[PDB]
Design an enzyme around this catalytic site. Structure first.
Site, mmCIF file in Angstrom:
data_model
loop_
_atom_site.group_PDB
_atom_site.id
_atom_site.type_symbol
_atom_site.label_atom_id
_atom_site.label_comp_id
_atom_site.label_asym_id
_atom_site.label_seq_id
_atom_site.Cartn_x
_atom_site.Cartn_y
_atom_site.Cartn_z
ATOM 1 N N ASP B 224 0.870 -1.143 0.000
ATOM 2 C CA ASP B 224 0.000 0.000 0.000
ATOM 3 C C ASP B 224 0.933 1.226 0.000
ATOM 4 O O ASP B 224 2.085 1.118 0.344
ATOM 5 C CB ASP B 224 -0.950 -0.046 1.205
ATOM 6 C CG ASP B 224 -2.316 0.552 0.882
ATOM 7 O OD1 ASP B 224 -3.326 -0.145 1.124
ATOM 8 O OD2 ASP B 224 -2.388 1.710 0.328
HETATM 9 O O1 LIG Z 1 -3.576 6.012 -3.983
HETATM 10 C C1 LIG Z 1 -2.845 4.793 -4.082
HETATM 11 C C2 LIG Z 1 -3.208 3.843 -2.940
HETATM 12 O O2 LIG Z 1 -3.172 4.630 -1.778
HETATM 13 C C3 LIG Z 1 -3.681 4.171 -0.544
HETATM 14 O O3 LIG Z 1 -3.983 5.382 0.141
HETATM 15 C C4 LIG Z 1 -4.963 3.359 -0.651
HETATM 16 O O4 LIG Z 1 -5.031 2.630 0.553
HETATM 17 C C5 LIG Z 1 -4.928 2.379 -1.816
HETATM 18 O O5 LIG Z 1 -6.164 1.691 -1.898
HETATM 19 C C6 LIG Z 1 -4.574 3.146 -3.087
HETATM 20 O O6 LIG Z 1 -4.490 2.283 -4.191
#
Ligand SMILES: OC[C@H]1O[C@@H](O)[C@H](O)[C@@H](O)[C@@H]1O
Ligand SMILES: OC[C@H]1O[C@@H](O)[C@H](O)[C@@H](O)[C@@H]1O
Ligand SMILES: OC[C@H]1O[C@@H](O)[C@H](O)[C@@H](O)[C@@H]1O
Lengths: 825, 841, 169
Positions: B224
């Site tokens: 993540d």
């Molecule tokens: O924005 C890119 C990633 O950022 C994170 O804040 C979220 O948990 C993800 O689901 C997302 O794909």
């Protein structure tokens, strides 16, 4: 002069090892050479059984723990434990295996009847009172079962998985209170695991917490057979293995571990031995006060009027009046009444298992009513609710043509080496009084390969004409013969129903007056047991009808219902919260026929009353000990004014309860999903309605209270409550209950927590003031799991003073600026 | 295709290998030219493709949110949505999609409950599988997230989900297992949280024992964003790639120093991680001919077509669930004299907040949908307000007031400076100049040569002209992550520089809203100006963002009566209510199940004036409807994406006949839910106390009644069904079900749901478990047979936690067939006699 | 205990050094600069030494373990393992370390600095001061000559070859 350290310096290694286990079921190890005596321990928490179940010396049976806790009376619980010490000296037991204080996280726990309260403050103060009363007499207490033995299902392996916060706040907490206030001489470790590790070898529990943090200096014994390793139990803090002869700590296992550097050191052994020696020192130091005689005889010498009156008060003060519309209660001695119900003539003095005993006598509720009124009392059974049929010995004779003397009432038990020429002799003969025969030591009986046979005989004489159902249960084998004619076979095909068989029964048409021959040929357990019973068969629909009819033909009906020590027993939990069999139908018919029926219920734990709305008077009796029936009479007629409060939440339905989904050992584990939210902590947080809440109970008079003074320092809370009987007829006791709330905490908390209570007796119109002082840290801490510490948090808090967890009558707000982190006591 | 994983692995040098273990920026892996390994671009998210930027980003096709998608109960349609996300990805030149999301709504309050599919692990898995097959069939890679037990937002970077292996297996892991078994996604994203004491992203047990050794899945694992927490453990333990760049944990110095010093990791671990990143790149490269993706390519709105519009509209309209329809209130007709009321009526709540959101081509408001439908103006009144914070400023301002309200003079101007206004000389030029349409300026991923990614230090002057439409009091607002000062006519009105208080803004990490209410004159021109500094200008900060807003103050009291007065005077009222992407968002959880502010008061008042009112609710997860007894028509619309308004209209007027079924249980009251007491990170943990009794598994077990159960949805017509054939071998179940439209007016789709139950198992279970479903269209009076075939092992196993394996127990079982978990119509008992223990897929 | 720790124990007991530098290598599987046994259990709890631990130069191998296990300061700058992002991210994510660990470490750095500052009037040190050869004196010269001359060990001297006398060719 019994010197622990000088004895530790003098014992040889083999003698050291021999102190680390019990000799037999009830005794430690005598070391003549150094003046170390054998110490007798005995069950249990509601009276003292002594060294044997079968043919046991009769004893004083107290009401069960949840009943005890319901008194909310420390002074009385303290008196009760003092009495338990006298009962123990009478059996020459220097140490009692009680009180029990596990926690009714849900209602179905098979030993729920045996502990005190779902509330850790009530449990801990109950525990502390009973232990203080025992030890003041110089008899040692054993608080059990440490810790989280909160259901019976697969207890030897069950892993209680519980957060450090719930662990601290609910389950360790009554032990902490007991240690802090009463310093028990002993503690018994649980059968289960906590977070993956058997308690009996858990360093966290047995050393880090009990020793390093609490500084408690007493002796830890295993529950019976609840030792699971040789070296780790010794390393990790289990001082003594019970029962003997030792399984895990033979001279060879132990010293082999020492010589082979496997796990333990001689320092580990010494540490355990030291703790045994300290318990022994307590016993020997009190021998002048107690008069315990080593391996002494067991008597019924405490069976006196003093003891009877006390067991009566205790039982009467346990009772909780739950409902009383229209003044059905108290009954007047001149009321025309009928007594109805399965528990009416039963003697349900206790829950099943190790907490049970043989009683001097038990007064049934019917008898209590008979004694009260001084004459015959109309009766009908209404319905049966037994789990298994017993009652055969209790209603049989050796020779029918001889009168029903004490010497002639019962059955004869003849023990044999073989099941044989005419000329074999019985090696033991006993007069059997109770139908369930529980096994037992004999020289002709091989200790742990015990093969023997029992010939059980006597005469049975039917008091009515018609059908009678006979029964047998065996663990092992046996056969039932009536008039030398086989009637029930528990030899040839067997079904498990928890070690032994299912009940097998035979219905037979008999005739009033006529003498039949009962003979039961039993085969020893491969240690055993069995139960031959008989009951008069009834037409269930007709009997419900009849009770209804009769109830309509009287001013008042008194219906006695509930569970019993076969439905609530060490060994297994309940399946459901239902009253048994046709009880509920019996109750509906009676309430339809006479709306002014008083219902008296006997159970250790909650049951559903589906007909509750139509029941105008409802009394929770509990299991009352020897004097249960008298105590019940006292309350119904108002010679005692009901003064108990529920030590447990009483939900409407099983599904409402917080442990609904996790009250079973599955894959060997029990997840404490509700965390800190147990009992009223759960129901107040959900705002779930219950039938009756924690701390509830009515009176025959009315009371009022207020906080009449209040003071907080940085360190302490002092509170003064004024209480007054606003009635003009009955004197009576009220229970002032003090709850705390955090008004603006960073942390999630229960709506409120019991932290104090006082019971106060008031004549009509009388006013008294009770004082309640506590250190903040006692009153308003929570366990901070992340920091590993208790925390007195800064903020605004509320004290609520009331007559139940709901019935709050006066409050005060206060502020806390001094934050505090702590561990220990 | 030429791309050869092993050959390239043997050719890469250590520096280059390390450089492959981390992204280069917010969205791109590392180009290596001498070896022809291209930069791969990845994009958010599960309900549309945002592309490479939040701020000033290229418009796109927003789909309905996950729980809406799952309510279709339509595998084919979900595959088709997948194909469409893929087309939308290609127009963004994104080779990889960061979605679908499939964490579990163990309680209703989750910040991202709206984003995932369902509380049911089967429906969630099948939905996941369906979307993943649609995207990858088209050659675009999926990334199923977030592995695993990221089931709330409270303190997600540290939160420890404490969960038994049984519940882990049967609820949480299980949609991923289904996804892997049926769709084999190219990527998975590791969660932010811990499971049982260990951060998922360095969890050997999750990332290797299960994913690799047990499931044999062979895709690539990404972190993540910032969800990496050690240098070496994460590498040893299976995390293939760290996002975003520039790297934090995985610089050339950290890794090689760890390697040279013999601390934790070996070169084999490094190679193992690189091999997996090469497998993903080969997926992309293998698909280049088919996809047309251009490395660091441009971003277009090229897929904004009528074919797209129609498909988004069909997906939304099929997501809609009808909850109540008494008194033939629905469908509406052109004749009915209707009024449209409510805080969500003219609102464009296309999606939940956070990484799942995007800039849309357009969003049809529910009011607009209705107007489009009737071809006239429709009466309206706001009723009440229900916004969490004040936006709307860019959406209604002009650069130059003197000119017409164009597409070129509308909005505001943003000017970026290396230096702040207090300090710069007037001959300092902006380094960037952008026209601003939306009031939320979200600078998370803003990129420029003047902005350092290791320390995004910069300033924005935001300007424009505001011309009020009524006289009265106006409320201006400012929220920031960083530093902000709001000027009206060159006098400061909001100060967000000094004494900043932590609040809801920016995934819960920004400031509280501060406001200034000012008396204003119609047609008069006010100069609005925001001075702003990024995160590092004002701890360790991200680029941040800010929001300037204005709203017309009203008499809330007076608008409720007005609304009721107006509704009494109409034949029917259509009341549009619910939550929005500020109440429901990545970053933090809801605090309760309540509808916001005066919403409830408004509803009571309208239902009193007029019982022939239809209520249309927009939310991703349950809300309490206190006045439920009195509401005769109730429609659950979710967040329906670009076409949300037209889909609502379609369903309201019956051009689309309601065929949605609830993907989530709808309890009456927050206290009824299984996770009531444990839906907060406390002492850094969350204990899953309900164990496997999640969702309808909980409610049925306690016989607790809910407002509306899992699988419930009404239609405009009626259906009956019955099991027409049944046959079980010792290793399969084939069942046939005939479904007939018993109505005579409306054609309709119905969802057949298949549930299983063990009858005298000795293990505790849920009463029943969804293990099959089918959707079928039927004309009035038409009857079709639908067939449903599954392996025993997939329909009746439970996870035996003591043995660490799945178990088909011998005993009696019950298949139950119906059109909700509470509307069983047909059952049959079967015996299973040969048992089965299994691990893996 | 008897060989390798001893010189340090003797120096802590008798001389109370202000600083100790952690070694590059591991002892029994664990890098010394993150070894709680060495840096805390022995140095702190057992010997009650209260000086400051600095790493050998680049001799730091983890972000969180070294902080938790008692390495007070990473040398040299600029930091590799202890950037603000790395550390505060570990703290906010509950990975390994707490603010108390960070405090514990900082506290030890503060004490070293305390020693330096309290002595600044005695020593006359100048922050970022220049570097002289001011101590290049005959008096210094004689000391280094003495110290050098006493270091020498004579291993053999058969038949009075030594001392040489200046009469010797
Ligand atoms: O924005 C890119 C990633 O950022 C994170 O804040 C979220 O948990 C993800 O689901 C997302 O794909
Ligand atoms: O009967 C002796 C002991 O045995 C075990 O069965 C019980 O758990 C204890 O409570 C009891 O004291
Ligand atoms: O030069 C600074 C440090 O460098 C390291 O390589 C040496 O081992 C230390 O003795 C020295 O103090």
């Amino acid at each position: 002069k019994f010197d622990v350290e000088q004895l530790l310096s003098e014992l040889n290694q083999d003698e050291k090892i021999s102190l680390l286990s019990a000799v037999d079921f009830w005794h430690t190890k005598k070391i003549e050479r150094l003046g170390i005596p054998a110490v007798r321990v005995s069950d249990g928490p509601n009276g003292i059984r002594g060294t044997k179940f079968f043919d046991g010396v009769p004893s004083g049976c107290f009401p069960n723990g949840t009943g005890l806790a319901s008194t909310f009376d420390r002074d009385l619980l303290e008196t009760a434990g003092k009495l338990m010490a006298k009962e123990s000296i009478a059996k020459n037991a220097a140490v009692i295996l009680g009180p029990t204080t596990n926690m009714q996280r849900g209602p179905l726990g098979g030993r729920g009847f045996e502990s005190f309260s779902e509330d850790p403050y009530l449990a801990g103060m109950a525990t502390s009172s009973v232990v203080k009363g025992m030890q003041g007499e110089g008899i040692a207490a054993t608080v059990k079962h440490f810790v989280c033995n909160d259901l019976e299902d697969q207890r030897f392996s069950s892993n209680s998985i519980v957060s450090e916060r719930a662990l601290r706040e609910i389950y360790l907490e009554p032990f902490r209170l007991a240690v802090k206030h009463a310093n028990p001489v002993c503690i018994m470790t649980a059968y289960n695991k906590v977070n993956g590790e058997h308690c009996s070898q858990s360093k966290k529990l047995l050393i880090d917490i009990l020793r390093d943090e609490w500084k408690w200096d007493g002796m830890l014994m295993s529950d019976w057979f609840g030792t699971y390793t040789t070296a780790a139990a010794i390393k990790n803090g289990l001082d003594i293995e019970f029962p003997g002869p030792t399984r895990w700590r033979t001279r060879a296992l132990v010293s082999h571990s020492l010589n082979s550097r496997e796990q333990i050191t001689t320092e580990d052994v010494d540490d355990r031995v030291r703790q045994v020696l300290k318990m022994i020192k307590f016993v020997v130091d009190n021998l002048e006060k107690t008069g315990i005689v080593e391996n002494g005889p067991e008597s019924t010498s405490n069976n006196t009027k003093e003891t009877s009156d006390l067991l009566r008060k205790i039982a009467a003060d346990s009772i909780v009046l739950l409902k009383n519309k229209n003044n059905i209660l108290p009954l007047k001695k001149e009321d025309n009444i009928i007594v109805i119900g399965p528990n009416a003539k039963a003697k349900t003095s206790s829950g099943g298992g190790s907490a049970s005993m043989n009683s001097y006598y038990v007064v049934s509720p019917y008898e209590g009513i008979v004694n009260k009124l001084g004459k015959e009392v109309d009766y009908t059974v209404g319905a049966y609710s037994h789990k298994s049929i017993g009652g055969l010995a209790e209603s049989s004779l050796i020779d029918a043509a001889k009168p029903a003397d004490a010497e002639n009432s019962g059955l004869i038990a003849k023990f044999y080496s073989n099941p044989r020429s005419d000329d074999e002799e019985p090696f033991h003969v006993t007069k059997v009084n109770r139908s369930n025969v529980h096994l037992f030591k004999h020289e002709k009986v091989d200790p742990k390969n015990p093969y023997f046979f029992v010939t059980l005989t006597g005469q049975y004489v039917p008091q009515e004409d018609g059908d009678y159902i006979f029964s047998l249960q065996v663990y092992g084998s046996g056969l039932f013969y009536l008039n030398d004619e086989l009637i029930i076979d528990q030899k040839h095909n067997q079904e498990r129903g928890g070690a032994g068989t299912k009940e097998r029964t035979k219905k037979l048409t008999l005739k009033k007056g006529q003498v039949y021959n009962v003979r039961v040929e039993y085969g020893s357990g491969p240690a055993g047991g069995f139960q031959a019973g008989v009951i008069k068969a009834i037409d269930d629909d007709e009997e419900i009808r009849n009770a209804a009819e009769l109830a309509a033909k009287h001013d008042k009906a008194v219906l006695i219902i509930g569970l019993n020590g076969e439905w609530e027993t060490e060994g297994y939990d309940r399946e459901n919260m239902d009253l048994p069999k046709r009880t509920n139908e019996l109750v509906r018919a009676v309430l339809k026929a006479n709306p002014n029926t008083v219902i008296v219920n006997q159970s250790g734990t909650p049951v559903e009353f589906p007909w509750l709305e139509d029941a105008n008077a409802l009394v929770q009796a509990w299991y009352g000990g020897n004097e249960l029936g008298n105590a019940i009479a006292d309350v119904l007629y108002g010679d005692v004014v009901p003064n108990g409060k529920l030590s447990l939440s009483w939900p409407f339905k099983l599904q409402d309860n917080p442990a609904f989904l996790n009250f079973k050992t599955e894959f060997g584990r029990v997840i404490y999903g509700e965390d800190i939210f147990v009992g009223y902590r759960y129901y107040e947080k959900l705002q779930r309605k219950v039938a009756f809440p924690f701390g509830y109970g009515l009176s025959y008079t009315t009371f009022e209270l207020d906080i009449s003074d209040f003071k907080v320092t940085d360190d302490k809370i002092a509170i003064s409550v004024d209480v007054k009987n606003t009635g003009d007829k009955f004197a009576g006791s009220e229970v002032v209950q003090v709850y705390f709330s955090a008004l603006n905490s960073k942390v999630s908390r229960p709506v409120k927590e019991l932290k104090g209570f006082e019971k106060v007796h008031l004549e009509p119109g009388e006013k008294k003031t009770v004082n309640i002082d506590l250190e903040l840290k006692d009153a308003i801490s929570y366990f901070n799991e992340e920091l590993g510490k208790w925390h007195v948090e800064a903020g605004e808090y509320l004290v609520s003073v009331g007559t139940s967890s709901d019935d709050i009558l006066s409050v005060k707000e206060f502020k806390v600026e001094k934050e505090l982190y702590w561990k220990g006591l």
